[model samples]
Target chain A: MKLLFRQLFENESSTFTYLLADVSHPDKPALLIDPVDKTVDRDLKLIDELGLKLIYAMNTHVHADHVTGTGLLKTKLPGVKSVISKASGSKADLFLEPGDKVSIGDIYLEVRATPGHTAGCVTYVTGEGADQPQPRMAFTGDAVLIRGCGRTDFQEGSSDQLYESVHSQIFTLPKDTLIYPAHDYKGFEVSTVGEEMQHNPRLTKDKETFKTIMSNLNLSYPKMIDVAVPANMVCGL
Target chain B: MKLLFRQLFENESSTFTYLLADVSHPDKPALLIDPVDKTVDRDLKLIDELGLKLIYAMNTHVHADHVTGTGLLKTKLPGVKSVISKASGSKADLFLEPGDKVSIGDIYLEVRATPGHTAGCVTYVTGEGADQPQPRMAFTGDAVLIRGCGRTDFQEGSSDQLYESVHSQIFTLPKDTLIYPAHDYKGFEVSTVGEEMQHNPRLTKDKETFKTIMSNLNLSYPKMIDVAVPANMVCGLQDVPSQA
Candidate 1:
């Protein structure tokens, strides 16, 4: 079976939205992760061109930098279901939990509750099924980035939880599993868990040192937090 | 005539939003200039507290830093009309031109075309009728700041136009006329035309020297301008935009 995938990008917010599907399935049901409100039309056009049916639209967690387009996408595609971690306290048609399996035709994604960047954060993985080869990819969202990680400064974020989540939930996966994060402002594409472990500066520090770094990031609220949080709480109006 | 005024600032963009009313009028119909969307409620409260009815919400031009609150104001206050210069190539309830008069109660403000900081820029002057002493105030928008003026490197901006606009339109006002600009990253609130002419480092030179200074400032576009400009062209909101 062929692996169908598309890594869409929006530069203004530096968000990397990921898409994948089971092309071998005739109905062509697809799964989208982290689509932005401003660029839903572009994603829809691609979905149309690819002749794929959108089964589930997921957010690793509710976002602050930009509103999730799930609400708007649901408006456009009546058949589509909006998915997010049940812990987000935000509305969603499909509330997801750890060990939940979201399927797109023949392909399936396993959910790992990686709550550290926020109270409700999950990393979705592809591979490691009974009949399949070892998991080759993981959409880490903000769980673990290439040489960097999400700022654990707010949104119920805890460096301790993040460190544990990264190790237990993400790093323990197959070393070669490709990590596709939700955002990368510096123009990066993918990072293997092995690459992250060996070269990631954040991971090099001991737990206490990493936790101190997170507490003192000196970060301010995101520019759109005033609007994005509320809009996203309602699932992108 | 005494003027009722409030000089408000939004911290993120360092933008100054101005509100004014003719204090002489008991039943106040006020005018608001350069309002930011996020803080519109505050402006409304000030109006409501002073018992002033908003008649006009105006912008200096199509801005590149943040979305103008004019559209949002109209949504909140159905009585207010949105105003901008006709040359802005944008939509508004009223398209003002040079020499046009805008009235707030018994007082009338003059519009002077000051297209330099941006192609559609205009300066609004108050206290300039025969009965009054002289022009006492000028809302310079981005055309002139207390000590420094806006960048003239892009967005249909011209150094020559800016220099000329400052000299011909702004400096011509009375020495005591208080200058209020659209923005000030610094803490300056007001400056007089005379003070700027005599003490402003940039204004002491000739037009050529001033143009050189503006050209070499090497100012880059405001980070949010691309998103801000399009939103302000029709005066709408996308996201509250990053002011990088």
Candidate 2:
């Protein structure tokens, strides 16, 4: 299968924005995940350079760290749609629910509600059918990081809920399925469900142990929460 | 005479945000200049920690590096006001004109038009009249840097205009006046009008020499222009309320 997947980063905010397109068609529409407001110009230049249409921009969740570029992208691209979880309680062109598939050309992503970090958090798996011919990739958002997982302290983050969501929704995927997360301070790129299940230090701990670990994380409040949260609610407008 | 001052920095953008207050009257309000949205938390925490009200949140100019926290600060501090240059072509609660004064208790800033770095840029002078008996200070925005000056190749930047703005507006100030710029990428905190007059490599050059230096510099577009410009037009309000 022809695939166009690129992992983009915004160093200032330490965010990971993904761009996905179907390689079979150059002019076909594409989908972007977790774009940063500061990187809109760079993202648009890449989209135009690649000769693809940006059909939709999705948020893995209402982010707390940086402002979203989804709305600004629409202002520039006019034709694009903003997509986010229905539970996010934010205004968007499209509100996705569990089992919903985001389709564009030959690509379709299966939405899975993985609410641990926030009730609105969702993980997208890049495949549809149960017996898919090609291997699938999972965008874990903040559900699970490369070796460490997201802090379950705010946005109604619950360690028990996160622990269960990973085991059932993410870890249940094929062992070899590729895993991509939202933020990585240590510069890790990609991992597999098998690798995380066996080696993810935080995820590997027992539920009670994981809860203790999460509580002791002592993560500070995000620098941009007061500004980013309100802006993201309106699709980063 | 009492003063409370703080210089905060956001490393990612290498931007400096200043906070100043009247220490004698702890209950009185304060002023903030050039705050970045990403550092609002730190600024607000400092304001609360210092036990002062945020009377006004000011911007050096419509920035291209990061979104201004002016609007966000108003959202958090409903009593606070947002100020910007009337020529900035952006909306704000209070629009300042050349020679205008921003007053809060004994603290007041005298506005001076300095349009070179950006068409709407202005330099604010603190303490000009009788009641204040000390060396004045100039918030030069991007018009003048510690040792360097702002780039004059874009955002309608002009070396000729910048040269005159500094010579007539800033350089003409008292020799010992403290010069505080919006940004200091090289770890410079403050300089004096006297020092800049004699030592500033860019401003000290002759007109022809200055123009040659500025034109050949060839600075690139800021990393956040696309997003920052649009948002800053409405005082950094991504979603401008019909009337807020």
Candidate 3:
């Protein structure tokens, strides 16, 4: 009755690729979030070994760090759909939006439009139904990282919208709900809603302060943005 | 009634440190296995944030790649006992042996002597009792890695002993039991007994073939072995200020 889960990492980009499956289902239906182009082989091998029937390869946003593996995964595993936010304006097999449910067997993720990291960024949270598991998990792309949030200086990022999105969509979840981010520079793997709400340095501050901090970060340009954004726009085709 | 678990990693050594707690208990008693000295601060902060009473800082074996955090942890965290296998011939507040149970509240780990990577190496497995949690996990130190095993060229490493130890101790576990190794260089976080039995390149081979492959590897020496071994012997006290 467990939702089989694995957190796979790609060292180069510090990206996290999540493998979620409804193991109790006879077919072992599965999906991947934020899969990277470099680790497709490893990801597919694990999927095959577990006898999972991969139904979807979903991206939280149009990434700027590393290329998305959705296109590669689709080619390798036939019948697998590539999913992205309808707001992302990216080419994909399926486009998702707020208030939608992505179901695999009895398990499903409740989609929440968590933008501001990118205009198209969205979060996929575990269903909170009576039949669903406890301690719902949110795969927050860049909208909320472990102790930080994504930078707002690029890709239609907005500090004001980011703050509003997190408070209304993510923080409102159960306190014990686990947070799985798209990336973690530090060694941190996961955090709880309670922990992040209490400890997130940037988000916990007043809206004015958070906006000021975002404006002043002065982070250098992303190394792969030029190439990655274009490739990702086409679902990393 | 679930066993709260987190697998932390140290990028430098590629070591995986595990934090396990009996969450159902009122006190939320917890234990950490294979903690590295470098990440002591990060590990402790997480433990504190979780409001866990860390009762034990256990080492899977005397590691050579990085210093263990047991000594540093003792000074910072009072009443937290340091643990190592009695066969390790190392100093610790608690010495474990085969069949020993390391209990934290109602949950416990069953120790099994697995000494092929090192003469003192042991694997700590989650209990299989009716009261215990399901899908038991085994922390196989360096004895068994994902798709690989530890090098047998040093640290009292014996290919034959490693072969027999893994087959007898680890491989015999229920196929579905999860395996948490001490380190993984390829970003692999976990494996299962069933997966390893079928896919592990080295251990899946015949004992003679395994020994032959291990001997001819001629792997280079570990860069930190010279400093790490001695520091770990005294429970990583080399850098910690001595106390009366």
The RMSD of every model to the true structure, in order and in angstroms, is 23.0, 19.0, 2.3
Of the two candidates 1 and 2, the one with more favorable lDDT, higher being better, is 2
Per-prediction DockQ scores? Answer: 0.01, 0.01, 0.64
iRMSD, model 2, in Å: 15.3
The whole-model lDDT of each prediction reads: 0.81, 0.83, 0.92
Output the lDDT of residue A148, model 1: 85
* Stretches of candidate 1 exceeding 4 Å from the true structure: A130-135, B1-244
Tens-place lDDT digits, model 2, residues A1-237:
356677776767767788888757656678999999988987887677567799999999999889999999999999899999998888899999999998777788999999889878999999856533256899999998877777777787789999999998999999878888988764345678987887788988899998888888766777888998899999887
lDDT against true structure, model 3:
0.92
User: Candidate 3 chain B TM?
Assistant: 0.97
Between 1 and 2, whose TM-score is larger?
Answer: 2
| Candidate 1 residue-wise lDDT at A177 | 83
TM-score of each: 0.49, 0.51, 0.94
**Model 2: which docking level applies?**
incorrect
Model 3, span B86-196: residue lDDT tens = 988888999998999999989999999999888889999999998887888999999999989998777888999999999999999999999999998877888999999
